[PDB]
Amino acid sequence: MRECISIHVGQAGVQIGNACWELYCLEHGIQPDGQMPSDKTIGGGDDSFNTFFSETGAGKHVPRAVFVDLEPTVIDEVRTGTYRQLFHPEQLITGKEDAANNYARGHYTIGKEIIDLVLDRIRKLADQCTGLQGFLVFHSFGGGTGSGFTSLLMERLSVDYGKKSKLEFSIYPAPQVSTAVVEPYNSILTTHTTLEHSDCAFMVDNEAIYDICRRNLDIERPTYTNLNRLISQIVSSITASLRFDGALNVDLTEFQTNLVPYPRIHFPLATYAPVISAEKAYHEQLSVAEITNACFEPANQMVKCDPRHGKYMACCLLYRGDVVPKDVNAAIATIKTKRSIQFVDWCPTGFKVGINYQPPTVVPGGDLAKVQRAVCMLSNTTAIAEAWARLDHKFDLMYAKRAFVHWYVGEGMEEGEFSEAREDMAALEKDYEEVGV
Amino acid sequence: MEVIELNKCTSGQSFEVILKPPSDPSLEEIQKKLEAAEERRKYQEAELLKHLAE
Amino acid sequence: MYTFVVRDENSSVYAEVSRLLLATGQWKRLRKDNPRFNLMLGERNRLPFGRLGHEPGLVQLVNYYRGADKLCRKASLVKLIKTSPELSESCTWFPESYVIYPTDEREVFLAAYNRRREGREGNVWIALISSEASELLDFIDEQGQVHVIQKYLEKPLLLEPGHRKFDIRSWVLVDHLYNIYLYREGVLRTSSEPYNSANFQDKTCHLTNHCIQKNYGRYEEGNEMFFEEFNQYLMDALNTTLENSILLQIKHIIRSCLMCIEPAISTKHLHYQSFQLFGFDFMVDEELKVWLIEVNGAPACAQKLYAELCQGIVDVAISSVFPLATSIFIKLHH
Amino acid sequence: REIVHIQAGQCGNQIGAKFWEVISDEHGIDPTGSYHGDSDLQLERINVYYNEATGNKYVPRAILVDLEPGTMDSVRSGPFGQIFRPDNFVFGQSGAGNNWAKGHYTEGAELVDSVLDVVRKESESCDCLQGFQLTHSLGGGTGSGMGTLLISKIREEYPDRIMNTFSVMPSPKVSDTVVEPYNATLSVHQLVENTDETYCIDNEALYDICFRTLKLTTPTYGDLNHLVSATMSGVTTCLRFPGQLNADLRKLAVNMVPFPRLHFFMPGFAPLTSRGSQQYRALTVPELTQQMFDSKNMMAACDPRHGRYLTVAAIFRGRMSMKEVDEQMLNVQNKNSSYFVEWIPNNVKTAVCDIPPRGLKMSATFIGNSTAIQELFKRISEQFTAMFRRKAFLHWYTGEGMDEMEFTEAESNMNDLVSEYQQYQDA
Ligand SMILES: Nc1nc2c(ncn2[C@@H]2O[C@H](COP(=O)(O)OP(=O)(O)OP(=O)(O)O)[C@@H](O)[C@H]2O)c(=O)[nH]1
Ligand SMILES: Nc1ncnc2c1ncn2[C@@H]1O[C@H](COP(=O)(O)OP(=O)(O)CP(=O)(O)O)[C@@H](O)[C@H]1O
Ligand SMILES: COc1cc([C@@H]2c3cc4c(cc3[C@@H](O)[C@H]3COC(=O)[C@H]23)OCO4)cc(OC)c1O
Ligand SMILES: Nc1nc2c(ncn2[C@@H]2O[C@H](COP(=O)(O)OP(=O)(O)O)[C@@H](O)[C@H]2O)c(=O)[nH]1
Ligand SMILES: [Ca+2]
Ligand SMILES: [Mg+2]
Ligand SMILES: [Mg+2]
Numbered sequence A: 001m002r003e004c005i006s007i008h009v010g011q012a013g014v015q016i017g018n019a020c021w022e023l024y025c026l027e028h029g030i031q032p033d034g035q036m037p038s039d040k041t042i043g044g045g046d047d048s049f050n051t052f053f054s055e056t057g058a059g060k061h062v063p064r065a066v067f068v069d070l071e072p073t074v075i076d077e078v079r080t081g082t083y084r085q086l087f088h089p090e091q092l093i094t095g096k097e098d099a100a101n102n103y104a105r106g107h108y109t110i111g112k113e114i115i116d117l118v119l120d121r122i123r124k125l126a127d128q129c130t131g132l133q134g135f136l137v138f139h140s141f142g143g144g145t146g147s148g149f150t151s152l153l154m155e156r157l158s159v160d161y162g163k164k165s166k167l168e169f170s171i172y173p174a175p176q177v178s179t180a181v182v183e184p185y186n187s188i189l190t191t192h193t194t195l196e197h198s199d200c201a202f203m204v205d206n207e208a209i210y211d212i213c214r215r216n217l218d219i220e221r222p223t224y225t226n227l228n229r230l231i232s233q234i235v236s237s238i239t240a241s242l243r244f245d246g247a248l249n250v251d252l253t254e255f256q257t258n259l260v261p262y263p264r265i266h267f268p269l270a271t272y273a274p275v276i277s278a279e280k281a282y283h284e285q286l287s288v289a290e291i292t293n294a295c296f297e298p299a300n301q302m303v304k305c306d307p308r309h310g311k312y313m314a315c316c317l318l319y320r321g322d323v324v325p326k327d328v329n330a331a332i333a334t335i336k337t338k339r340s341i342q343f344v345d346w347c348p349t350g351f352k353v354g355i356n357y358q359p360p361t362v363v364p365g366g367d368l369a370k371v372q373r374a375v376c377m378l379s380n381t382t383a384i385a386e387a388w389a390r391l392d393h394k395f396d397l398m399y400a401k402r403a404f405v406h407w408y409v410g411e412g413m414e415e416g417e418f419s420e421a422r423e424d425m426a427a428l429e430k431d432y433e434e435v436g437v
Numbered sequence B: 001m002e003v004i005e006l007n008k009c010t011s012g013q014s015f016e017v018i019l020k021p022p023s024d025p026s027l028e029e030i031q032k033k034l035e036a037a038e039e040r041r042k043y044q045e046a047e048l049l050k051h052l053a054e
Numbered sequence C: 001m002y003t004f005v006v007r008d009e010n011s012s013v014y015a016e017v018s019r020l021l022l023a024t025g026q027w028k029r030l031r032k033d034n035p036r037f038n039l040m041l042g043e044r045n046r047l048p049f050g051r052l053g054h055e056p057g058l059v060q061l062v063n064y065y066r067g068a069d070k071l072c073r074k075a076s077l078v079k080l081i082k083t084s085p086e087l088s089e090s091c092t093w094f095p096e097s098y099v100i101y102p103t104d105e106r107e108v109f110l111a112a113y114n115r116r117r118e119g120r121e122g123n124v125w126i127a128l129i130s131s132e133a134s135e136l137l138d139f140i141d142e143q144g145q146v147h148v149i150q151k152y153l154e155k156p157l158l159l160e161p162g163h164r165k166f167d168i169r170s171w172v173l174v175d176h177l178y179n180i181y182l183y184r185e186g187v188l189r190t191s192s193e194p195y196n197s198a199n200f201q202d203k204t205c206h207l208t209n210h211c212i213q214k215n216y217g218r219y220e221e222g223n224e225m226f227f228e229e230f231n232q233y234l235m236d237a238l239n240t241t242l243e244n245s246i247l248l249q250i251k252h253i254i255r256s257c258l259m260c261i262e263p264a265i266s267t268k269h270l271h272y273q274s275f276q277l278f279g280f281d282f283m284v285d286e287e288l289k290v291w292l293i294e295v296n297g298a299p300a301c302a303q304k305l306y307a308e309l310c311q312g313i314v315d316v317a318i319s320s321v322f323p324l325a326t327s328i329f330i331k332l333h334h
Numbered sequence D: 001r002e003i004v005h006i007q008a009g010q011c012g013n014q015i016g017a018k019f020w021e022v023i024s025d026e027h028g029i030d031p032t033g034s035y036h037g038d039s040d041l042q043l044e045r046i047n048v049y050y051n052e053a054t055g056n057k058y059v060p061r062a063i064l065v066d067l068e069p070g071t072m073d074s075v076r077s078g079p080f081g082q083i084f085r086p087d088n089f090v091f092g093q094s095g096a097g098n099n100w101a102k103g104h105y106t107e108g109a110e111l112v113d114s115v116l117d118v119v120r121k122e123s124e125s126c127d128c129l130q131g132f133q134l135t136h137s138l139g140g141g142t143g144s145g146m147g148t149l150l151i152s153k154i155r156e157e158y159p160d161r162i163m164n165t166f167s168v169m170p171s172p173k174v175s176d177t178v179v180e181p182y183n184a185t186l187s188v189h190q191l192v193e194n195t196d197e198t199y200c201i202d203n204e205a206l207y208d209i210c211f212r213t214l215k216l217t218t219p220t221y222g223d224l225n226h227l228v229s230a231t232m233s234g235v236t237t238c239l240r241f242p243g244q245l246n247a248d249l250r251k252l253a254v255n256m257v258p259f260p261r262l263h264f265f266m267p268g269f270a271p272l273t274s275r276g277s278q279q280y281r282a283l284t285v286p287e288l289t290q291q292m293f294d295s296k297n298m299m300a301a302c303d304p305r306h307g308r309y310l311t312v313a314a315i316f317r318g319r320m321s322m323k324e325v326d327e328q329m330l331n332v333q334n335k336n337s338s339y340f341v342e343w344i345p346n347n348v349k350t351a352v353c354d355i356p357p358r359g360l361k362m363s364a365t366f367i368g369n370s371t372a373i374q375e376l377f378k379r380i381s382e383q384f385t386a387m388f389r390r391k392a393f394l395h396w397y398t399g400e401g402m403d404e405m406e407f408t409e410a411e412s413n414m415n416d417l418v419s420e421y422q423q424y425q426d427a
Helices: A010-027 A072-079 A103-109 A116-127 A145-161 A183-197 A206-217 A224-243 A253-257 A288-296 A325-336 A382-399 A405-409 A414-437 B027-053 C013-024 C074-083 C106-117 C133-143 C227-238 C242-263 C303-318 D009-026 D069-076 D099-106 D111-125 D142-157 D178-193 D203-213 D222-236 D251-255 D285-292 D321-337 D371-388 D404-423
Strands: A001-009 A053-055 A061-063 A066-068 A093-094 A132-140 A165-172 A201-204 A269-273 A312-322 A349-356 A373-381 B002-007 B014-019 C002-006 C027-028 C037-039 C097-100 C147-151 C166-174 C180-183 C187-190 C225-226 C278-284 C291-298 C329-333 D001-010 D050-051 D057-060 D062-066 D089-091 D131-137 D162-169 D197-202 D263-268 D307-319 D348-353 D362-370
Touching: A001 A010, A001 A145, A010 A066, A010 A072, A010 A132, A010 A145, A010 A165, A010 A224, A066 A116, A066 A145, A066 C180, A072 A093, A072 A414, A072 C303, A093 A116, A093 D203, A103 A145, A103 A183, A103 B027, A103 D142, A116 A145, A132 A253, A132 C106, A145 A165, A145 A183, A165 A183, A165 A253, A183 A382, A183 A414, A183 B027, A183 C291, A201 A206, A201 A253, A201 A312, A201 A382, A206 A224, A224 A269, A224 A312, A224 A373, A253 A312, A253 D178, A269 A288, A288 A373, A288 D142, A325 A349, A325 B002, A325 B014, A349 D307, A373 D062, A382 A414, A405 C329, A414 D263, A414 D307, B002 D178, B002 D251, B027 D142, B027 D178, B027 D362, B027 D371, C002 C013, C013 C037, C013 D142, C074 C097, C074 C291, C074 D371, C097 C106, C106 C133, C133 C225, C133 D111, C133 D285, C166 C303, C180 C242, C180 C303, C227 C242, C242 C278, C242 C291, C278 D178, C278 D222, C329 D062, D001 D009, D001 D111, D009 D142, D009 D162, D009 D222, D062 D069, D062 D111, D062 D142, D089 D111, D099 D197, D111 D142, D131 D142, D131 D222, D142 D162, D162 D178, D162 D222, D162 D251, D178 D371, D197 D222, D197 D251, D197 D371, D203 D222, D222 D263, D222 D362, D251 D307, D263 D371, D285 D307, D285 D321, D285 D362, D285 D371, D307 D321, D321 D348, D371 D404
Parallel strands: A001 A066, A001 A132, A066 A093, A132 A165, A165 A201, A312 A349, C002 C027, C002 C037, D001 D062, D001 D131, D062 D089, D131 D162, D162 D197, D197 D263, D307 D348
Antiparallel strands: A053 A061, A269 A373, A312 A373, A349 B014, B002 B014, C097 C147, C166 C180, C166 C187, C166 C278, C180 C329, C187 C225, C278 C291, D050 D057, D263 D362, D307 D362
8 A cells, every 4th residue: 555645735725625535534434533433444554545544543534635825714714624623733734924826926935934844744744654656736826825835845845755756636727716817827837837847737627617517507606615526526536546446547656657648748638427416306317328428528528628629648437336347338439439539649549447336425415416327537638738728828918018027026036937937838839739730 | 349457346347448559956956046036035125225215 | 799800801701791790780890819709700720719718708609610621621631531431432422532742642543543544544633634643743742742633524514605614613601500501602613715635734724713714704704604594504405404413412512521520520519619611612524423622611702692692601600699689591401 | 914004194084084984884893992793794804904902892903193183183083083092193283284395304204203103013913914004195295295204114114015005186176275286296206116006086086976976066075085985995895804705905916016106096986875865776786887887986087998907806795696797797898898908818807795885785896907097197297287387386395305306206207107007008
């Protein structure tokens, strides 16, 4: 058994972390006080769920996770939340003042006065690991903390944990739920600095999650709660292989192996189905073929784009519930003859499939209905680059006039880093082009 | 068509299906970047307090 | 009050469309780089489809289908027909063609060139037009770009009086629901100089482009015969109609080509929607058998038909999505 | 994140006292300083403006300043006069006689250190001071002269704290003296340099609204302040209450100010109402949106169609369909996209608060960084030049040690500020 440490940075990271670890507890039958009855190895053990939970002699199961935010507001609700007993104080780090939606303020200014503390609190978890795999880092692109401090952290982890992998769960900015006009700056800036320090990053466009919550859950105005409880289901699907018995994606290295042939291009597109409303009176349960066919519908993707006009480098299907290989292969065969699925010439056209007979757990009183079978497709398609194009365009519009640049320069950053980051993004868009067309 | 690497267990099972075959900076440098930016902040604040002194 | 933008100034068709829209007093034109638009009359190259459908509170529409270049490029059209079971190699309305790269399927082309020579039948091809394979391969490598070799229809239908060659242009509109609308008015781009069977060097009676011809304007105005006259000629000279002898095949080829690529370009469940005007070029042999020549993704219209067609586009492609405060199209059902 | 309030001069103290009167009611605080509300939404972020004492007494973190005791005595005998910490009353006796030089160089310099001692005392109590907000006029002597002096000295001692200001602009329509253009031009020169955020509260606008819209035949300073306290309550809403987004004075500056000097905002409000006269009909969301963007609702006498919006922040107060708010706000931008700069994507952000202001079921406050604001400064510049070309009334200033060159510099910098706003109107 090898351990995984989850790091939640900024508001988005923390609040999503709350959604995930809440869901994790329900899936593993762990109670808010950290007690797990089904665990007969009291005080320890090397089970699959121990990848995410360490154990105390008192029989408490605590998340191998750290929460960090340059503002105490959000994490303070974790300290007093329902799962307050779950974490211990040393896991919840808070600053005095936030990065004010400023990458440079979160990275250079305030980042410098707390980075050593965080790494120390992280080192305290790593010391409790027998064989640390790596880290799962949850954050946002738009936030000053989520963008600024994350990149700095990712840089140091590559120094202190050179042999360890590092996966990302990043929130791509969307105007429907924006918190700043300069989020495009923070997004480009953090991507550039983090790119070489990330092995596999799962982007989630809030725009995509927002419309899914409106279209399928009939929520007129999705709250962060509505967005997070849905994202947590996706994260759960991706991390289930690390928390349960299986042979597919059993460790972090296998993510890069199965989804990331080219290092820089490490942004797999996620597609989840089905999303059904809890207060939907009458629902006809969907079949393996129906849910699998929905994995190729752009309306179900974590990022809105068109895989048809791109090329696949890899593709994983992660089922949960009543599913058997026979029905899966039958579904794939049908879909292949109906949809456009082009793989790059230097990759085999196929699908790595993972099934967990336990259907997807739902938060009691949540917005999601229980289903008999669900699926999450992780496809590394060059079509995701449309998101970079969108973002880089918004970046170019503002930077041409050097708007808002003075706020960053005032924090000790150089105006050159803007162009340096944008150039790296220009190279990234090209790498996607060469592979895609 | 071709199903391979079938691995079954109690929790579930996994496999692979093929339809068609194919055809870092150091700690020194980091501390240097953070301190360099801190100097620029100090210089800016000094110019301000010098301007305010006038 | 809807809004739109223009990013293709050279578009004679949509220059008229933008004019008609403003004339309704319910459409407001914006600058090129204004993202807050309902409609986009995009450019021909590097159209940013990636930035469409990401504006909250805006239903966005564009006058182009992403991936439709696979049908509107000669090298792509051949590949599309040969690799698509729906069309297949056995399809009878497309001339025998091959893709050739300069120094690919060159070896395959010569295998068929032998049957024509070792059969003593018609063996003339086109990229220039020649009966010698060596003269053609030497021409492609001397140009630079990728060219397509295609069987030349040595026995074309010839208009009388004149003994003239011609090609038919059909304007098709595909809306956001992928309804295929054939414009009832087509046009014959005719040659004024009589077709010469022996001398292929003279490319003025072999090629029927409106630019090359411009005996221009001897028989009809501007080397353009419309359907009413051509229909009358067929009745008088061949005892048949345009509908029967030709138009059925045209409606079949058009319906076939677009149904083929529908799953690859359809914007049914997308975040943005697409429509597009196409220009199909057809060729008719002496046995009244229609052949597909090529498809134009950015077609121009005939002067007489601009007013009616452009108005038509607004009605079924634009106003259908953005309604305001008998039909000139033939719906090819499927 | 505590905010330290300062109010200087006659105008500054009268709008400042009215401000605390209004929001105290919104937070359920009585003149005694005791809480008597019904919602916990009132106390969740009340620390931003109020200090807490034993027995759960809430004291404004405000500092009252003036060079004459006249106006401050009226405050202390006013409705919520007793709520203010009596030690925060710092005043002189000589006044400033509507002279910028007196407030900035001679009379005010003699009192400024006393004020900064109170500022320091409050600041040291703050868990994490985010900045200061100042209320004052620019046409007078104290609030205009000494106010800008305080700002300069506050920046010196707290250079990494935000400086916000509610600056009342002078107008001949509502004039005390003829030297108001001088005092204003001198003050704007300071505000361009030493503030991150300035709400331009133009008296010309406040008069036109009372006269034209509210049909008040002869408006008073009381009528003008009903509009000010309504605007001040509105813009500070997302600072005082918890919500989807929670605002602070720094995040405010970052997203509203694309360039450091261009930080002069146009406040707006809807529905426009006069004192006493209650309205029975609540406005529909489409009406709140249309009105708040209308020039007739702007607190700065500027035609927004004569310029382009760099950034916009809107706050809707009351119980309403936040979906409908979203649609209407998006409808405005989509209908009039020409008046929003294209080189700042998504420069309009909206927020909603459940608690409405007193006397209204729902309202909408507007904050716009428009290039049309140049019309305001160009107006002051013309009135300035008309006298300065003859050196009229300049002896009041030169008698206090000032030189003509200092006027020429202030004039030049404001004309620059105008041209800068003009630069991005044609981008
Ligand atoms: N899906 C989702 N997105 C969120 C959530 N919270 C914030 N965001 C997004 O995060 C982006 C801004 O980053 P934040 O996380 O809010 O800011 P931060 O990381 O705390 O950094 P600071 O500026 O220092 O506060 C916005 O675009 C939001 O849409 C959340 O709970 N769920
Ligand atoms: N394989 C063939 N057999 C007989 N004629 C052919 C032919 N290929 C091309 N042509 C003749 O080709 C002339 C010019 O080529 P084509 O029509 O494809 O124009 P481009 O100029 O090639 C397309 P367009 O001008 O419509 O944009 C055709 O209009 C017709 O005169
Ligand atoms: C107390 O005053 C307020 C301040 C803010 C600002 C603000 C202003 C913008 C913008 C984004 C943001 C965003 O980054 C906010 C986060 O928190 C803030 O302070 C910020 O785009 C153009 O104009 C917003 C308010 O409501 C909408 C408000 O009422
Ligand atoms: N809105 C408003 N403006 C005022 C008020 N009192 C004075 N003013 C304006 O401020 C200017 C006079 O400045 P004043 O405040 O009297 O100077 P000070 O007291 O010495 O700082 C004039 O242009 C007035 O229009 C007031 O109560 N409300
Ligand atoms: Ca155990
Ligand atoms: Mg934050
Ligand atoms: Mg006065």
